[PDB]
Inverse folding.
């Protein structure tokens, strides 16, 4: 068992340093690059409130009840623009435990005015212990943010004009009206300041590659390195993906590749002299030194790779404690692991169900990456065709369209570690308030005893008095 | 606070692209490769049921009780083969809340017949609120899958015959009878279609390496690259691990390595002519261009390494939120971290207990990667010798042997994130049903009040009536 | 649904093998390295106990209560040194459920003597069901460990003397008295055996690099590779960080770099002869073979990189199930993911709140990496300047200074997966003891019914008897 203390200190993580190889090539070829400018120019806002009305009006009576309603409101153009300018909400008043005898303030305000905040989350609470009167509570909601628009850039060859397209969820161009309000799924969105691009020139290093490697006197084409990929720029045409385009003009050329030297064939320019052994040895020594430099670069790269490998293994070993299926997944097997210490562990195998087109197996469901027993009759999804994406695909997820304005969700449908984070306080309260042990015993009967014996005792006392 | 919405979309992760280096070597050497064929040919099946019988026969009585039994059944040869052919179970009927007055169906079926399913998990429920009669519930279990057999391949040199061995858990050959039924630990397994192998030829690139690097006129031996390792194939003998074997025949040879060129020594073939400066400059230019190509490959590799490093750092930074011991483990230190935001965090140190041969420290136990207080007197394991394995060791975990047919487990012994996933619904039900707050007050006394005051009130009413 | 079984086996993880490139450079340059010796020489110890005193003295009375106290004790010099020698505690006796009629042992011992243990964690339990008498419980604490001291090494040039400095949390030298006792935050620390260093010689490979790459006849300086970085050692001065210092002496020199060979210029040593085509072809063949070796090293490095990339992608795919914000973080976006199977998943976007200097948004707090609703009025931290550190910065976290001896903490302030690990048993007990369902009904009223109806029934029975 370790110990926890009061000593701390603020910190931030800095990336590991990678030393570039020495003696880099010379960049002397100009490349034209066109890409869209970075600009959010999308506004998102929402607002809502929660209300509860209660009136025990005593007990053992039908005059008792606590009804609650949740509402979502739209946001106007002027309000949303003013919020974007001020980066704040304009929201109503908070009511907590208001006695209902002359205070029914939860019935006179429905828009929400007076208070400006940078963001607020509603909390719901119910308390109706005052029998002789009414009670009501009210809470409010805030939200304001910006996001970038899903876009794409394309250019033509015969005219050299470029245009920017606005894409939907599936990636298709669509008409969007600028400076207007759209409501869908309980949020309001506005688009403004249509996107623009820019052009610049970048120096790069290029060489000639042979198409056929094991055949001399073959066809060669130009290749250049831009960021992490080698592009074929033999042809002077636009070629690009997403929003970044590459072009090499005709006038900018590349140094020619000398042919192989052989006897019986004239060797380029003629310089009539007699060579000596010293020149050959000088050339040999220079080339050996160059090879030595290349070798040193090789060991540097190898050391970097080894360091990364060690770091990755330490990472996986540390992380495997929480996720018990990581080791099996990395082995392309189906086992689960439990740890006896920080170094040693055990293994335990599972089976694999037959292939299926859904996530339901006769009262079994797949959730949170695990198969568990299920009793919900209707919670099943039929598998359809899937798309595939990489980490660097530059995809956005906010689209200003029209649709249903009704919204509904539940706190029970929380993903991994979001449920725990959201319900930690409630779990702590439940655990502390209920003193778990061998004292609670009102669970051995049915709901009859709540009213039966109580009313019978009341009547017995009344006619015995 | 962010927001959750109704907008989604199916997706799949695609691996990052790694561009191979240009101008690859030429593969002109034939290599013989022998490996075992991929074939599951192992059958696994299981079946069980759960039964509960209850009879309150009123309350305040000994005539009330809810006894439950769990049983596990074996599977025959014909049944298991038919299941494997159909990929389905043959299981009995489900009984839910059957009044016991003329319905005692939980006493007439014990094999399980009528229903064919692809997989079913049993759910246990008890309800005995009907005092005047009996009640009983029943559930059932399904399971069918296949797995590969742990095997090993070895070959001899003097005859060139290869054989496949079947290995146990420790990795020792054992006799296994084909097409028979074995029962152990509540499951049934059948082995069929003994393993086979195949032979093929693969082209590869080979060179000669010097044994002593800083000594000219030294001994050299042949080396070839197959997948990610350089193998010494100077000798024409079989050498292999697990189930994949490598061989190079005598007739297939490798190009010779020219010796170093020096003066006073004849230089291989004689071509009597006079060299000129132009030839030397041509050779120099060609070799410089080759060096340029090699350099470009170097920068490409460096860029790939940098991209991987950035991705790994982003991964660890994102993951460190859940596991608070990751940063300390990666630093070879003993600290814990808490986050103030998505970028900044704090640190807090622990201590290290003295070395021990178990996982128990005087009412302290090590579970889920953490040291916690313990009250269970007997839960301790004495450490023994440990084996070590890599991710790519090709080990299996299903072995058809004989052993005890009794099986028992508990839902309390769940590993990390399996307990949470399995008990999420029950936790939600407990939290929602119990309205945590300052209302529950039946915990301030002992179990006496369940019967004492109730019976005393009953008697008081009886003699006061 | 898979299955869990009784079959297991101890194991340990072995790091993946990285084959170094063939034909490594020759190491012939001596380098002087000075670093501090590895030595813990810091002692940490602590001790405490927990006591509870209770006396129901019946019920319905003020004579009932359960008061508990927690105390922390200092450790003397002799006691801590003796513990360090024996690697054990010297702790008192455990009292469990002692009837108070002639047994008040929880009032006579306050130091803790008799028992020697290697480590013990206290468990707190309260039970006061014996009305006629008293009861009390007692528990105890243990702790002993060692850690290394935060230090730094510096050396001077004109004299070649090195010294070791002791650093505080911020990294500043401070006076520390050796062999003395310091108390702070409820722990005791002792420093002994002030640090020392050592000197050794290491062979390394060095070359000459040009300062200006695209200009012949430029200035060059010496560079050497030590572990994973290339250091400039052109000057014979000490240069070092943390505690490891590097030096190259004047007498140890590096081989000179030959100049470029050109016509009209004498080529180093003169050897008057006539070259032939055979010599040139021999040189060409040798250099081509060297280039082939370099290429093979290139493909080996590429294969290693590809293997690492595949392993990292498998790791992230497996881990993404628990942390639903990993995919969005790796994409530099703000989305959350839910999984339909082990391969396919969905996406769901959030918003981004405006920039702020704290972690509180009007009843919202940031904890465990998530934004959740908050009701605690005062739990907020104002952001200050942050430091940045790498994984390999060699920082320690135990400092023997003076300060407040009072300590206090709570089990509610647990970080990620520490709360779950510590409260798993209590959660299991709460879930099992409370049979969640539609039976608990004592929550529909207020705390009045605990005493009201009970006392009224008591009085009714008393005057009806
Ligand atoms: C990780 O494990 C996966 C699950 O075992 C492997 O996926 C299976 O690989 C099999 C062999 O490559 C393939 O199954 C069949 O194999 C036999 C070979 O004799 C042939 O019938 C077919 O080639 C192939 N498919 C069918 C329909 O028969 C499949 O690729 C796949 N089987 C599945 C999904 O059921 C992965 O290959 C493995 N990854 C590795 C080893 O790198
Ligand atoms: C990560 O941290 C580990 C825990 O501190 C280190 O493991 C310890 O390293 C020590 C130094 O290498 C070794 O302990 C003793 O060191 C002294 C040196 O003067 C010598 O006595 C011995 O070389 C060594 N062993 C003994 C029995 O004395 C051990 O290797 C180890 N100590 C333990 C396990 O108690 C790791 O080295 C460290 N990893 C790094 C720095 O890369
Ligand atoms: C990952 O996402 C981050 C959040 O979008 C990016 O951080 C933002 O990048 C912006 C563009 O580089 C920068 O914001 C402003 O951009 C405009 C450009 O026209 C200019 O005003 C400024 O260059 C820049 N800053 C200001 C004050 O305007 C910022 O770097 C940053 N914005 C923030 C933090 O609000 C990361 O760049 C992105 N990482 C990538 C793409 O690799
Ligand atoms: C957008 O509008 C233009 C003209 O208004 C039209 O030519 C184009 O087809 C529209 N894009 C669509 C419908 O995707
Ligand atoms: C399994 O589910 C199917 C749903 O189509 C149902 O028809 C079948 O009866 C179920 N099997 C049982 C309940 O044993
Ligand atoms: C969206 O669907 C809901 C059904 O719940 C309906 O009430 C609402 O009117 C719909 N809105 C639109 C714009 O179609
Ligand atoms: C398997 O059986 C063969 C012959 O039946 C025998 O030679 C061999 O030793 C057996 N393998 C064992 C016992 O591991
Ligand atoms: C610690 O455990 C050992 C078990 O051998 C026991 O003998 C000893 O009394 C324990 N120490 C206590 C209870 O303080
Ligand atoms: C296995 O052990 C159990 C003890 O729980 C015993 O009842 C059973 O008969 C044993 N089976 C065999 C095959 O030895
Ligand atoms: C430590 O003590 C020495 C002499 O006792 C003094 O010169 C030095 O400044 C001290 N270090 C500090 C105060 O950081
Ligand atoms: C938000 O918090 C601030 C704290 O300074 C407070 O003044 C303001 O009233 C709060 N907004 C509400 C309660 O709507
Ligand atoms: C530390 O602060 C506490 C306040 O909680 C005080 O009681 C104690 O005396 C202080 N100790 C020292 C050494 O200043």
């Amino acid at each position: 068992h370790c110990n926890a203390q009061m000593k701390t200190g603020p910190y931030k993580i800095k990336n590991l340093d990678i030393t570039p190889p020495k003696e880099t090539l010379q960049k002397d070829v100009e490349i034209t690059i066109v890409e869209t400018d970075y600009n959010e120019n999308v506004i998102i806002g929402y607002k809502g409130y929660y209300q509860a009305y209660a009136y025990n009006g005593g007990s053992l009576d039908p005059n008792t009840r606590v009804e609650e309603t949740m509402k979502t409101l739209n946001v106007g153009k002027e309000d949303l623009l003013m919020w974007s300018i001020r980066q704040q909400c304009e929201v109503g008043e908070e009511l907590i435990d208001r006695w209902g005898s002359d205070s029914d303030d939860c019935f006179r305000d429905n828009e929400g005015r007076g208070q400006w905040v940078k963001g607020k989350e509603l909390v719901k609470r119910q308390n109706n212990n005052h029998f002789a009167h009414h009670t009501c509570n009210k809470s409010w909601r805030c939200g304001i943010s910006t996001s970038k628009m899903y876009s794409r850039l394309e250019c033509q060859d015969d005219t050299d004009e470029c245009q920017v397209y606005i894409l939907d969820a599936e990636g298709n161009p669509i008409n969007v009206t600028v400076d207007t309000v759209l409501h869908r799924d309980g949020v309001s969105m506005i688009l403004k300041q249509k996107s623009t691009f820019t052009t610049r020139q970048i120096k790069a290093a290029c060489l000639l590659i042979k198409d056929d490697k094991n055949n001399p006197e073959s066809v060669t084409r130009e290749h250049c390195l831009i960021d992490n990929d080698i592009y074929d720029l033999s042809k002077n045409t636009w070629n690009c993906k997403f929003n970044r385009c590459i072009k090499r003009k005709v006038e900018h050329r590349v140094k020619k590749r000398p042919p192989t030297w052989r006897h019986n064939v004239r060797a380029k320019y003629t310089e009539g002299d007699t060579a000596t052994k010293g020149d050959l040895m000088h050339i040999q020594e220079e080339l050996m030194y160059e090879n030595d430099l290349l070798k040193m670069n090789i060991e540097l790269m190898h050391a970097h790779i080894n360091k990364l490998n060690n770091m990755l293994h330490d990472l996986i070993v540390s992380v495997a404690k929480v996720d018990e299926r990581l080791i099996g997944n990395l082995m392309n097997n189906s086992v689960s692991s439990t740890f006896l210490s920080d170094d040693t562990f055990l293994l335990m195998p599972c089976t694999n169900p037959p292939a299926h087109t859904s996530n339901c197996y006769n009262n079994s469901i797949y959730k949170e990456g695990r198969w568990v027993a299920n009793t919900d009759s209707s919670q099943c999804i039929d598998f359809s065709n899937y798309k595939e994406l990489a980490i660097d695909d530059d995809v956005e997820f906010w689209i200003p369209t029209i649709g249903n304005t009704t919204y509904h969700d539940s706190w029970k449908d929380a993903s991994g570690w979001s449920f725990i984070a959201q319900q930690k306080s409630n779990l702590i309260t439940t655990m502390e308030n209920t003193k778990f042990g061998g004292v609670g015993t009102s669970l051995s009967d049915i709901t009859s005893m709540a009213e039966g014996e109580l009313a019978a005792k009341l009547t017995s006392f009344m006619f015995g008095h």
